[PDB]
PDB file of C-alpha atoms and ligand atoms in Angstrom:
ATOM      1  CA  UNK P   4     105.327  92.896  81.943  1.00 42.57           C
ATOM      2  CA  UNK P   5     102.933  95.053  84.660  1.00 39.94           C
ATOM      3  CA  UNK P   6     103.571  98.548  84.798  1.00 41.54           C
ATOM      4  CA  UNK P   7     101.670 102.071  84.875  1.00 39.38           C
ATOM      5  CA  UNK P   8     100.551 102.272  81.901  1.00 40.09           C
ATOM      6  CA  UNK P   9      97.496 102.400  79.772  1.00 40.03           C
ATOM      7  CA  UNK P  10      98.133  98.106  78.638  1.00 42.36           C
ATOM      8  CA  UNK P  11      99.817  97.162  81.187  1.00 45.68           C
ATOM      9  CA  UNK P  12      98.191  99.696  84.454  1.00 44.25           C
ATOM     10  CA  UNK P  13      96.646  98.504  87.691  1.00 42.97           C
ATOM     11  CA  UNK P  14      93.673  97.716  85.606  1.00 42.17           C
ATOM     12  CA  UNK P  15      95.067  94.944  83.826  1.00 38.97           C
ATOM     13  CA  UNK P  16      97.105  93.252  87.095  1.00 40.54           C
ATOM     14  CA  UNK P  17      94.649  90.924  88.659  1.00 42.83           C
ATOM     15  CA  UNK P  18      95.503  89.018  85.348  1.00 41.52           C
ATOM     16  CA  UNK P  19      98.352  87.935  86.083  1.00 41.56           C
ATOM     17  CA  UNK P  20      98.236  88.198  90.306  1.00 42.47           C
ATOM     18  CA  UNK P  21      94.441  87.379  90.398  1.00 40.26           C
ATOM     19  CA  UNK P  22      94.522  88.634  94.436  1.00 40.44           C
ATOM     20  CA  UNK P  23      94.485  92.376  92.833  1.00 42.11           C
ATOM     21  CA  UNK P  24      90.484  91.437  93.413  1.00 46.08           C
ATOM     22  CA  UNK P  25      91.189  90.227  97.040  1.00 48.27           C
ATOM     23  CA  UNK P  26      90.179  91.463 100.173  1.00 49.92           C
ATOM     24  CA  UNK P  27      92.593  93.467 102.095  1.00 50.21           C
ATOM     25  CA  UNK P  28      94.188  95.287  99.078  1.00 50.75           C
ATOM     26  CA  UNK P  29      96.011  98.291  99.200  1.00 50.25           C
ATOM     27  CA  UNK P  30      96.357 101.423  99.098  1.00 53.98           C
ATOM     28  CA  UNK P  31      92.465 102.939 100.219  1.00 51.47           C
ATOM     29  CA  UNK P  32      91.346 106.090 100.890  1.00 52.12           C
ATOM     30  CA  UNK P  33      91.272 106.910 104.714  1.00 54.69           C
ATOM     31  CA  UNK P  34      88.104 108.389 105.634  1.00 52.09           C
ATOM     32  CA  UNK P  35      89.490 110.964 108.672  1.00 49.60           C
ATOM     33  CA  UNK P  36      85.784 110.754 110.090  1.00 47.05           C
ATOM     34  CA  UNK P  37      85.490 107.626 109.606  1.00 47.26           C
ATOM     35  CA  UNK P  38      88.270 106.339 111.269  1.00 47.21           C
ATOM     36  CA  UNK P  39      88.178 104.888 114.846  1.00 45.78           C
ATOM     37  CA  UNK P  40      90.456 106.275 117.422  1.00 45.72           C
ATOM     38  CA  UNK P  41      91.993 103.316 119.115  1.00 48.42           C
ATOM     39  CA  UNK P  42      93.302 104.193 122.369  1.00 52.82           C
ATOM     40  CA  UNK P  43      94.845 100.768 122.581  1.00 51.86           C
ATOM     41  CA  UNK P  44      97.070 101.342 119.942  1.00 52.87           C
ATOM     42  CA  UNK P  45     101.024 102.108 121.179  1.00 53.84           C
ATOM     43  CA  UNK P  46     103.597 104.817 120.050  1.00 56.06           C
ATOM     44  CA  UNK P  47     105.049 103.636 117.354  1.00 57.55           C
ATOM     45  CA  UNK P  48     108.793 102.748 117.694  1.00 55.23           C
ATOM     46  CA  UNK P  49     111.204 103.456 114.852  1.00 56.12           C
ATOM     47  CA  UNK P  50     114.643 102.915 115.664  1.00 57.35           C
ATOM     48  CA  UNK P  51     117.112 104.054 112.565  1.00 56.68           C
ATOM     49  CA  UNK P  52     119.862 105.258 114.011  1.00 52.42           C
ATOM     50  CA  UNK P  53     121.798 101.867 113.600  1.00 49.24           C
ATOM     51  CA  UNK P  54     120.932 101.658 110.010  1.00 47.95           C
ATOM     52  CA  UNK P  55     123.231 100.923 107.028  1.00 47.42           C
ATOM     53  CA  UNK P  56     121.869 101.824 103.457  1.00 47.29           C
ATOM     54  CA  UNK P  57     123.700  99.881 100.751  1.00 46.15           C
ATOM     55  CA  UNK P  58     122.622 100.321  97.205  1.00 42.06           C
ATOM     56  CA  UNK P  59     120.455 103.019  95.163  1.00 44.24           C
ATOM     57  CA  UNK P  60     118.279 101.042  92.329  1.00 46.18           C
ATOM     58  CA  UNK P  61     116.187 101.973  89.319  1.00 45.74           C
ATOM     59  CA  UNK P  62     114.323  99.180  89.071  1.00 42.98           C
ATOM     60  CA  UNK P  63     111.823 100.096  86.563  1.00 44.21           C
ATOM     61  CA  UNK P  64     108.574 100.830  88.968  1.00 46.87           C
ATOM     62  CA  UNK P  65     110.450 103.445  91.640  1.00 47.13           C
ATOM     63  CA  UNK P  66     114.055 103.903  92.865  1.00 46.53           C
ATOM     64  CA  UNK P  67     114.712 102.490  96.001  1.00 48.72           C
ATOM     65  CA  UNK P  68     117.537 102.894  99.069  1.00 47.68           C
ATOM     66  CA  UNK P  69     117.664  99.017 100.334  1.00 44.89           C
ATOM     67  CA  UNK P  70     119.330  98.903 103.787  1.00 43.26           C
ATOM     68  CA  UNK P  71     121.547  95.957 105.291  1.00 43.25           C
ATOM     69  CA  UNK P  72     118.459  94.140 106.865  1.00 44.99           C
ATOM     70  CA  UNK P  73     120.926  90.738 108.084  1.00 42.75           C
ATOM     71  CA  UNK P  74     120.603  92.267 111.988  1.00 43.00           C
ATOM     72  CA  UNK P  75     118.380  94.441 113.684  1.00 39.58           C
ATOM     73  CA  UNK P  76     119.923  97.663 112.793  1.00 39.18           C
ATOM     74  CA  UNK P  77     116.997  99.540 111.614  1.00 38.32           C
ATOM     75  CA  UNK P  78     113.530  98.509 113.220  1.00 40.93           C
ATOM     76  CA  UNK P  79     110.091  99.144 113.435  1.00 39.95           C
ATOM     77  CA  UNK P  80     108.139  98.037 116.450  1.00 41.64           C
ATOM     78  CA  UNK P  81     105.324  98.620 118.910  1.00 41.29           C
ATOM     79  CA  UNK P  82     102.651 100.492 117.254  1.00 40.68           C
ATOM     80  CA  UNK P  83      99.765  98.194 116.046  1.00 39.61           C
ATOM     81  CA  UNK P  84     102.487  94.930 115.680  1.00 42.71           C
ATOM     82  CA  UNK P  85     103.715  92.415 117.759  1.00 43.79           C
ATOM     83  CA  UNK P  86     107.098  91.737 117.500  1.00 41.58           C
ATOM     84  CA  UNK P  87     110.581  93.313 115.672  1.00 43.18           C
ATOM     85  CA  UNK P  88     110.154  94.534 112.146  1.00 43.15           C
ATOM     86  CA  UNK P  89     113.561  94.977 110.269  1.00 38.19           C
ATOM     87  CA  UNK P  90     113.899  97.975 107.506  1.00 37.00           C
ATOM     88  CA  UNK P  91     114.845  96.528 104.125  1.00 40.28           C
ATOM     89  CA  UNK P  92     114.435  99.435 101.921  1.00 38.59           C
ATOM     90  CA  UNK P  93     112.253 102.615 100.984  1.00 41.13           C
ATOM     91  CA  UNK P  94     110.868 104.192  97.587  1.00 45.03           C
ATOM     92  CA  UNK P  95     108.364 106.556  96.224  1.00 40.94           C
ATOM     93  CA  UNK P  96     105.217 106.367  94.303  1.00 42.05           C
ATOM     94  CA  UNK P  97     104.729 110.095  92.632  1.00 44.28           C
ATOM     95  CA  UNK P  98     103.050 111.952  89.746  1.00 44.42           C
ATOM     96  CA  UNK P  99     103.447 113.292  86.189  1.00 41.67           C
ATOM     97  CA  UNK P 100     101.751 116.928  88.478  1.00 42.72           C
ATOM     98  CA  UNK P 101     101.929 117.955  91.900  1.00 41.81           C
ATOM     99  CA  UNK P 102      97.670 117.436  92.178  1.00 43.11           C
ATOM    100  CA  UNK P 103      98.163 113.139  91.905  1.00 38.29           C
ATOM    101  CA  UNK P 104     101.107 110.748  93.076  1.00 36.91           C
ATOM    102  CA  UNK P 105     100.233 109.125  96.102  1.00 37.33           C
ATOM    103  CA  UNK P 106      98.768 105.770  96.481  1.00 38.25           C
ATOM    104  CA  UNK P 107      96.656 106.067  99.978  1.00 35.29           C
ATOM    105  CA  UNK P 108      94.113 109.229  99.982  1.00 32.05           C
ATOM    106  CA  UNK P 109      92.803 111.511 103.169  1.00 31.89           C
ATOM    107  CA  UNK P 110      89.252 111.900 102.351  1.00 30.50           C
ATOM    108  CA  UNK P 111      89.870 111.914  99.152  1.00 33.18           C
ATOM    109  CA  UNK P 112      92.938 114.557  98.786  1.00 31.42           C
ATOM    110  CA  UNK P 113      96.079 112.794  96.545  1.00 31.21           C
ATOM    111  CA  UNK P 114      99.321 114.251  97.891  1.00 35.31           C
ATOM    112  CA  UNK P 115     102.440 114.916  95.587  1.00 35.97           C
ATOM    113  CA  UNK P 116     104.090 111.609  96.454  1.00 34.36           C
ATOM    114  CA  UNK P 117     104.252 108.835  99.212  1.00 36.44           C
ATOM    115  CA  UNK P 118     107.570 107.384 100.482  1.00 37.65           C
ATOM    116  CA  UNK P 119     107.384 103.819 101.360  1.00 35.47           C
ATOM    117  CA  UNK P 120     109.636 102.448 104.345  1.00 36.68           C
ATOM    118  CA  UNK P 121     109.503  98.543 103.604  1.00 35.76           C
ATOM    119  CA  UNK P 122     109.946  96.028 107.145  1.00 36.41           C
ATOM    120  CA  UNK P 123     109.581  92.632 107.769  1.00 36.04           C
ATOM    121  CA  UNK P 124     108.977  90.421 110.646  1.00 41.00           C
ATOM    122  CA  UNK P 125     111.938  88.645 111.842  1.00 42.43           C
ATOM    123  CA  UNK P 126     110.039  85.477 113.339  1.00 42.89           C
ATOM    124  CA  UNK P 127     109.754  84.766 109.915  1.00 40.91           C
ATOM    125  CA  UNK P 128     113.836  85.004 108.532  1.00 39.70           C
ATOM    126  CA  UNK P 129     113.567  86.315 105.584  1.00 39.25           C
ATOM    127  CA  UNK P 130     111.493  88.737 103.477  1.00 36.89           C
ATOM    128  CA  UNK P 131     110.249  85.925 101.306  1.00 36.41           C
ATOM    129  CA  UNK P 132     109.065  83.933 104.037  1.00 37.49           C
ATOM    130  CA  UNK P 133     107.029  87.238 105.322  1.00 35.13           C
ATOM    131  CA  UNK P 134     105.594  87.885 102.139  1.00 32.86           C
ATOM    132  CA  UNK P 135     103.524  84.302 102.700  1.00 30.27           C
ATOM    133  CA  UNK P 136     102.129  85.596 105.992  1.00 31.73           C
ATOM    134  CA  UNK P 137      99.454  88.123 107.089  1.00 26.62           C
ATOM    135  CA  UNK P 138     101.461  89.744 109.628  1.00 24.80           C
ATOM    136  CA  UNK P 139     104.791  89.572 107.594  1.00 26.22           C
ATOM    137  CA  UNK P 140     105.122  92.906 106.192  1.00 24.30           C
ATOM    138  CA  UNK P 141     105.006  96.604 107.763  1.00 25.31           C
ATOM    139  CA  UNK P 142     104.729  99.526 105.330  1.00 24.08           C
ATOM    140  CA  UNK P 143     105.555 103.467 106.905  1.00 21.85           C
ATOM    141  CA  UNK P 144     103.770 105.840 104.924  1.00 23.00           C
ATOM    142  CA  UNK P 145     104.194 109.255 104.578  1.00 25.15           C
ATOM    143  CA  UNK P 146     103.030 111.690 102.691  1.00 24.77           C
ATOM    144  CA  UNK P 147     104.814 114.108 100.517  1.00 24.52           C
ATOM    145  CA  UNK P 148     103.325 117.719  99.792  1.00 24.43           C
ATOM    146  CA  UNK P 149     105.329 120.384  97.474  1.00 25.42           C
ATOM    147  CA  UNK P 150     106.259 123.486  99.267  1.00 26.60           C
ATOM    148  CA  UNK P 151     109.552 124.151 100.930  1.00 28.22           C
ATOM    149  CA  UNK P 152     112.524 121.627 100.786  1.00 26.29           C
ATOM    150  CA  UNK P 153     113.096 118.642 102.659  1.00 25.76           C
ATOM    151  CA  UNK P 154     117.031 119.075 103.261  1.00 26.06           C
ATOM    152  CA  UNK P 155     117.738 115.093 104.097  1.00 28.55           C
ATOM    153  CA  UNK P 156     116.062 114.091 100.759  1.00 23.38           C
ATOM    154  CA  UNK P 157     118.760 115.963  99.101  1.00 22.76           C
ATOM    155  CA  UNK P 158     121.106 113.713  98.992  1.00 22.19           C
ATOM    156  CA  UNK P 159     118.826 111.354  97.381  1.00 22.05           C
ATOM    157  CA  UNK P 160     117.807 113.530  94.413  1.00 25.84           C
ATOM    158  CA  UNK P 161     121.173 114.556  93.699  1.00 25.74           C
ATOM    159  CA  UNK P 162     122.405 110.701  92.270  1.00 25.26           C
ATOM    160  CA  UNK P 163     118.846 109.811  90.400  1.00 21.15           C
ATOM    161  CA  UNK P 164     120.910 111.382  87.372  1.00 23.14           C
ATOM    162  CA  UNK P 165     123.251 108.376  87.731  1.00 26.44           C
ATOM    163  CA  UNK P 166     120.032 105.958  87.823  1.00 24.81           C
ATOM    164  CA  UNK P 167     118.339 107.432  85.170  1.00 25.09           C
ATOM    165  CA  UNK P 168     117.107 104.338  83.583  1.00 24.02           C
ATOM    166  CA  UNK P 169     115.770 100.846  84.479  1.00 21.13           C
ATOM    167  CA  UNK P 170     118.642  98.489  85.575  1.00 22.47           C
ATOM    168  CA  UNK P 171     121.160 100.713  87.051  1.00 20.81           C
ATOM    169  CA  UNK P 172     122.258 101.530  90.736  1.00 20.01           C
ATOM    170  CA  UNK P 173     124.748 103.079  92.573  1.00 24.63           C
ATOM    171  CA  UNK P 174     126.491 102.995  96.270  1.00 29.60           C
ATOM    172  CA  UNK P 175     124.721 104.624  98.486  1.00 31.12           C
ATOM    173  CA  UNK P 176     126.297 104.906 101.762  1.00 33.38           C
ATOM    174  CA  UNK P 177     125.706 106.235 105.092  1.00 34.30           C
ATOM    175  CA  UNK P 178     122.381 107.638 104.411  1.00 35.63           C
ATOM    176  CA  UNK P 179     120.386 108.333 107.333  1.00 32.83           C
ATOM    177  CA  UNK P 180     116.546 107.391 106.998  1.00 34.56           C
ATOM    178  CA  UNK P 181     115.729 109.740 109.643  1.00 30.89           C
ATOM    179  CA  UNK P 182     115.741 112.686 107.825  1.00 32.98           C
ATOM    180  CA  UNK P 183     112.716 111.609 105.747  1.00 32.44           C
ATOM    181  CA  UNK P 184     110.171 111.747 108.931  1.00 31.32           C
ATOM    182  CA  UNK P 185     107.787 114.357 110.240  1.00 28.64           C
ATOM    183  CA  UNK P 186     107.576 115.530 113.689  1.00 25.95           C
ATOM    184  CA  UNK P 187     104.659 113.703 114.457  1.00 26.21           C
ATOM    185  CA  UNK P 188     104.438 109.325 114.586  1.00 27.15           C
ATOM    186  CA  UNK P 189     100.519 110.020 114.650  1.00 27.37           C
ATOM    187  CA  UNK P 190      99.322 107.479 112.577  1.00 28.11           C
ATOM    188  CA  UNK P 191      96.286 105.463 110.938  1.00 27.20           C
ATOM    189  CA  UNK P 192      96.165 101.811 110.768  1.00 26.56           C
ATOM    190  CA  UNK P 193      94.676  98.497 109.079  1.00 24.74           C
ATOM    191  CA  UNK P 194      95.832  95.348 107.078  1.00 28.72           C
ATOM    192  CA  UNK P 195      96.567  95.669 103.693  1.00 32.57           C
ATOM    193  CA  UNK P 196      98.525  94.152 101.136  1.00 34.96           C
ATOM    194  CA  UNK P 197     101.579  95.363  98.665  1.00 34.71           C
ATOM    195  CA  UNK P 198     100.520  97.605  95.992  1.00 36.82           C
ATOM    196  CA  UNK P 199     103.089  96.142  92.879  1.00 32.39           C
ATOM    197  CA  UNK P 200     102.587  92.850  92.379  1.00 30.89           C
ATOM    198  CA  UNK P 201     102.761  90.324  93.487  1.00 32.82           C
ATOM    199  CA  UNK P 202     100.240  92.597  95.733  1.00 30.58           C
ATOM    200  CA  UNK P 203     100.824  89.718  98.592  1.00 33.69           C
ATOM    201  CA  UNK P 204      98.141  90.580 101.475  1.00 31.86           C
ATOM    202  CA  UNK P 205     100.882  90.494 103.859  1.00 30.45           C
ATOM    203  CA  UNK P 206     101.119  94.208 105.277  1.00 32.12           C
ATOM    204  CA  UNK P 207     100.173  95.779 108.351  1.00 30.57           C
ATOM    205  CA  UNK P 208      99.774  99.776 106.793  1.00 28.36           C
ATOM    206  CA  UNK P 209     100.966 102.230 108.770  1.00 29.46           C
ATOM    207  CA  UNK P 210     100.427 105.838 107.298  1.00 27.95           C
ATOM    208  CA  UNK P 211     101.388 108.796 108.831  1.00 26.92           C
ATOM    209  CA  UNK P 212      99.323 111.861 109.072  1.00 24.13           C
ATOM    210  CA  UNK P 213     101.720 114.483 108.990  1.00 26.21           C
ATOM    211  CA  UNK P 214     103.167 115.151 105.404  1.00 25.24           C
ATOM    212  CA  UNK P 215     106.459 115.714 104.896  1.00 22.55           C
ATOM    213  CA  UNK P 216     107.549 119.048 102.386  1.00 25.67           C
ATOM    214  CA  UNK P 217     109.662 119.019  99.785  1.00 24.66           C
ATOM    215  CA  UNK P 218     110.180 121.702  96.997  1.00 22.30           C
ATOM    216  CA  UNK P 219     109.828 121.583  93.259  1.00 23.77           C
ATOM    217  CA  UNK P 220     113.009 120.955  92.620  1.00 21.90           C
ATOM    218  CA  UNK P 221     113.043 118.236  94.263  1.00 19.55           C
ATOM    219  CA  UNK P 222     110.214 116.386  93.081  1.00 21.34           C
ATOM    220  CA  UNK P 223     110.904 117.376  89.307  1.00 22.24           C
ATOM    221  CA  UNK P 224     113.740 115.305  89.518  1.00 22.41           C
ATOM    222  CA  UNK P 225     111.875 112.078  90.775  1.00 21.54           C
ATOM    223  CA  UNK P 226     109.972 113.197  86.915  1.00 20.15           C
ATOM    224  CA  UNK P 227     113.020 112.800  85.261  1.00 22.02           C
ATOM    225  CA  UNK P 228     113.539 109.456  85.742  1.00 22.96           C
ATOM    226  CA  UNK P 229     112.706 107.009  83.018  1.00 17.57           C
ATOM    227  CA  UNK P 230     110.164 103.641  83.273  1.00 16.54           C
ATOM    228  CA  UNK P 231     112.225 102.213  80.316  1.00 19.04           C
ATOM    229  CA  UNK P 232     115.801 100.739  79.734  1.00 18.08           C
ATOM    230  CA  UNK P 233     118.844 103.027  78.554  1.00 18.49           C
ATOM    231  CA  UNK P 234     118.452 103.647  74.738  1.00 17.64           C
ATOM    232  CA  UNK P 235     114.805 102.273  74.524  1.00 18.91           C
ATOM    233  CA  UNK P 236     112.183 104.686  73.765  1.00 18.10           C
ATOM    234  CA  UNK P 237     111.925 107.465  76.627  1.00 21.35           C
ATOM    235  CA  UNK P 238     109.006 106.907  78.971  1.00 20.55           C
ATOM    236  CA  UNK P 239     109.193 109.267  81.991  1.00 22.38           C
ATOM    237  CA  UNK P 240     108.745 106.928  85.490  1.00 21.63           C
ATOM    238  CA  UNK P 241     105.504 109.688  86.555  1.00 19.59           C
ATOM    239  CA  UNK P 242     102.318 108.549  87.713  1.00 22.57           C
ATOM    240  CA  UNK P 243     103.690 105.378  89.655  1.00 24.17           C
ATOM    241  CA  UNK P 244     100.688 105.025  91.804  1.00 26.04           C
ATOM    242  CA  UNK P 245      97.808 102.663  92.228  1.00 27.51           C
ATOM    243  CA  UNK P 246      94.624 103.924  92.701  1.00 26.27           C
ATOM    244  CA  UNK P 247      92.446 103.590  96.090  1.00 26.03           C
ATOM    245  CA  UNK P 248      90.938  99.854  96.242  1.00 24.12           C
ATOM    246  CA  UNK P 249      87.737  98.813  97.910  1.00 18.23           C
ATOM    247  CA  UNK P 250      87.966  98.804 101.608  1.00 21.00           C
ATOM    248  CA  UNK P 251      85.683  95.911 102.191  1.00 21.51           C
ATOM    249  CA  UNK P 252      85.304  94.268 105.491  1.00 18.84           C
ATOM    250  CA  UNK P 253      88.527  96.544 106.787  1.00 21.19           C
ATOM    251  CA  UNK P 254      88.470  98.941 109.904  1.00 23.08           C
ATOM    252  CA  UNK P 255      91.081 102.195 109.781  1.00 21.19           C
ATOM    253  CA  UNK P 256      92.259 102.628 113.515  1.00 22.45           C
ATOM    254  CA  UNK P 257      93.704 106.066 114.316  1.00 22.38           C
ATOM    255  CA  UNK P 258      96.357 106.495 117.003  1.00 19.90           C
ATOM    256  CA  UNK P 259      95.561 109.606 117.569  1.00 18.83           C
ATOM    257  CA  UNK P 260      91.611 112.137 118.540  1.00 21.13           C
TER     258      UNK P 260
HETATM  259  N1  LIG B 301     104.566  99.757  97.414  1.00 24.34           N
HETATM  260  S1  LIG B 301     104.826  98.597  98.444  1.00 24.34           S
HETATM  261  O1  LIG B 301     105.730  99.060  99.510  1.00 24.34           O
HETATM  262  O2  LIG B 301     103.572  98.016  98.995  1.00 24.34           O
HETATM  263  C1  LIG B 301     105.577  97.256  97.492  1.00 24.34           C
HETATM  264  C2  LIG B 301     107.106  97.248  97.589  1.00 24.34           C
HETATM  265  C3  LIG B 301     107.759  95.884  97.313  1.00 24.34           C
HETATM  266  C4  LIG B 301     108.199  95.172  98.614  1.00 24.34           C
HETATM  267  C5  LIG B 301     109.481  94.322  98.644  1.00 24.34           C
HETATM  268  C6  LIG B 301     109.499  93.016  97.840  1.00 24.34           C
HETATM  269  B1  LIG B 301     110.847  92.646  96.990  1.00 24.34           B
HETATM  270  B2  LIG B 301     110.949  90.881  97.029  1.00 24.34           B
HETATM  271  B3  LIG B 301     109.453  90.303  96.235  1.00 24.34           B
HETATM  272  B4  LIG B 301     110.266  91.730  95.598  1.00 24.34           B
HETATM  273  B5  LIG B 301     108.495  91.685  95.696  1.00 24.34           B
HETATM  274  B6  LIG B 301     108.013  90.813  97.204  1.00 24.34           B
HETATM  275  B7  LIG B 301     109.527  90.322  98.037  1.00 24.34           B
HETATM  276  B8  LIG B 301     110.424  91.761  98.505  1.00 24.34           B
HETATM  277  B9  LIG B 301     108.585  91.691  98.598  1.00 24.34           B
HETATM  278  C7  LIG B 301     108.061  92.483  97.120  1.00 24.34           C
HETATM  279  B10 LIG B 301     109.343  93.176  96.135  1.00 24.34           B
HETATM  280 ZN1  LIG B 302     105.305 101.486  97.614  1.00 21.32          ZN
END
């Protein structure tokens, strides 16, 4: 029933998943000034080059790439977490324009789009089990902005025209995650929760600084996908994005001066 709209938006959630009014929701704006530079805080460690993407899905919020996630092939560690964090799949949140589309905000600025790289916590077994746990998630963020093209996205945009509509997939093979990340891991930090529902408070954020580029090609096809079912009444999949939430009794740590 949720979606993006205007009866069914992130204004109406906490209806149905009353912890939309919680207190470590996400995304927030990230106050650059603000934030405390923690030097404590590790490189983080992404290790992809084991990974093994499966599946491309239209699943009627985002497309996503989910990943084999039954061994540590593709992990996130060190950072701010303790422990092993296995990838289980990645998807955007973008706009209807190139001025809105991202969830989190740097003082205030909305990029283009934000790609989401979803782990979770192996000492818990399963991704369902995480989701019940404060430290069970770990969301990469990153930043899209629209200038020149991103050339390991490309193979990406070029099947969302065989995903057009809610309910259908595709293979997608031997697609290499690493290709999606800036130079820099500098990052900001702080506990948060996911932003669809159920909008668990189960993540540890980690957003990274440095955008990534891709051109207008690229993102105009992201805009042609479609919220609704094949046949239904078109309703483009833009403006996927939940706005900033209160940041309460939370602390932003930067990794970086
Ligand atoms: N924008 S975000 O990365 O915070 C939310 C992405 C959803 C994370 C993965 C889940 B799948 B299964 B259940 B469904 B719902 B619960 B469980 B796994 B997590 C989320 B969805
Ligand atoms: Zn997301």
């Amino acid at each position: 029933h949720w979606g993006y709209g205007k009866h069914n938006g992130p204004e109406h959630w906490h209806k149905d998943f009353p912890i939309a009014k919680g207190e470590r929701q996400s995304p927030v704006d990230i106050d650059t000034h603000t934030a405390k530079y923690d030097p404590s805080l590790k490189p983080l460690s992404v290790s992809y080059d084991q990974a093994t993407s499966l599946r491309i899905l239209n699943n009627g919020h985002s497309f996503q790439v989910t990943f084999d996630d039954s061994q540590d092939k593709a992990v996130l560690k060190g950072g701010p977490l303790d422990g092993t964090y296995r990838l289980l799949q990645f998807h955007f949140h973008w706009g209807s324009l190139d001025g809105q589309g991202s969830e989190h905000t740097v003082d205030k600025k909305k990029y283009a789009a934000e790609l989401h790289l979803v782990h979770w916590n192996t000492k818990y077994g399963d991704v369902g089990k995480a989701v019940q746990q404060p430290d069970g998630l770990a969301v990469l963020g990153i930043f899209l902005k629209v200038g020149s093209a991103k050339p390991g996205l490309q193979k990406v945009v070029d099947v969302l025209d065989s995903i057009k509509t809610e309910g259908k997939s595709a293979d997608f093979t031997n697609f290499d995650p690493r290709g999606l990340l800036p130079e820099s891991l500098d990052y900001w930090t702080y506990p948060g929760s996911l932003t669809t529902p159920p909008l668990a408070e189960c993540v540890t954020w980690i957003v990274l600084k440095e955008p990534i580029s891709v051109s207008s090609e690229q993102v105009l096809k992201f805009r042609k996908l479609n919220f609704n079912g094949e046949g239904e009444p078109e309703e483009l999949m833009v403006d996927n994005w939940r706005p900033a939430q209160p940041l309460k009794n939370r602390q932003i740590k930067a990794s970086f001066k």
